Point group: D2
Chain length 123, copies 4
């Protein structure tokens, strides 16, 4: 069992507009997801989207946010096995620290061998 846990905004999107319905896709990143799906990886979209607007209220995110996510994922033929909302929002200046984390430009640029290598170096 192997999953990719994939952020939505800025990772699968170009984050060019506040209108989530019409945000531009990052095509190279999405195409890489497809190749990983072919390799047996499950794809989990995990996102903090609208955690700021609703002050962490998942009950509201489930109503106003989820529909537009799925609609957008479908329109751009992004493969996904799961969607998860309510991810902790780091804030404007915040960020995530993780030994198994890659940035979307590294994911698009590297094969599995050399992603494995990035991680082994940490260990």
């Amino acid at each position: 069992m192997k999953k990719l846990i994939v952020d939505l905004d800025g990772t699968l999107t170009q984050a060019n507009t506040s209108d989530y319905r019409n945000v531009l896709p990052r095509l190279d990143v999405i195409e890489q997801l497809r190749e990983y799906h072919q390799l047996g990886f499950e794809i989990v979209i995990s996102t903090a989207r609208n955690m700021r607007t609703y002050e962490g209220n998942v009950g509201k995110i489930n109503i106003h946010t989820l529909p537009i996510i799925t609609e957008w994922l479908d329109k751009h033929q992004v493969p996904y096995d799961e969607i998860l909302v309510g991810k902790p929002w780091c804030g404007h200046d915040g960020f995530y620290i993780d030994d198994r984390a890659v940035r979307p430009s590294e994911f698009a640029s590297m094969n599995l061998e050399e992603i494995h290598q990035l991680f082994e170096k940490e260990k």
Copy 2:
């Protein structure tokens, strides 16, 4: 409002042993957490620990896992404002993809300006 969201196993720990009580600290990473706390950043420990063992049951994780995490964090003087369990487990071969993610070796060796640069280069 600014937060670091920090993984536990492999980021704050050297992952040298299955005994979580007695696992060795990554001292350079923790020391960097202290400097960021000084800058006004809130520290959130977020972990998938025991998601495999309990098959996703946070009801059990709350009982068996949380006490040992806090005890360990306290023992090693790790600053934290929040703990969050129930992070999605990626499996042995899985990983996270995120435009705001840094690995613990990058976090330990770069300043804020430098981290900011990694991210800005992602936007074009």
Copy 3:
């Protein structure tokens, strides 16, 4: 701030069929919900639907369960401010124990004073 936390199956529905899209509404209970909404109560639909099927995987409930919940709620004109999925599944013989809990027939048949009296007895 005052909230009704409302179960879905067997409370807002008659639980007459496993086909959630076409399941019959409990009209009296829904209408009482309309009154409480007018009185300033936030309405939170909380449900364990498809927890059994997906074995607690909300990643999948978000994809396959949520759309049908909202479509149904919308067509039967149920007031709601929040939907919450991922509620613990009690199993067939299991149940819920809460000092502030009413069953749908009690809610349908009593007024606010009466319900408060039901709880004041508990104290």
Copy 4:
């Protein structure tokens, strides 16, 4: 598989003081939990405790709330297999509506048979 989903304050406790560490147990309710535990019922303590104080922030509840819940459950010899926090807070006048819900003094006074009877009247 069969589960009791049990609320904490006012159900397992007498809710006589805001000092959770020294709050009185409802001995009859706890003793009934033990009998259900003997019959093969899993016991899930589920609670909104400290959701008001921390404004829904589970990251804080895990730190300041869980240890005290656990020490108290252990002290009063309460059987449990799971603790769930972060349950939605109904507010002062709010309440829960569920077709499988019993109040803690219905649980205390009835046996399994009549509790099932209590539910088949709703069905």
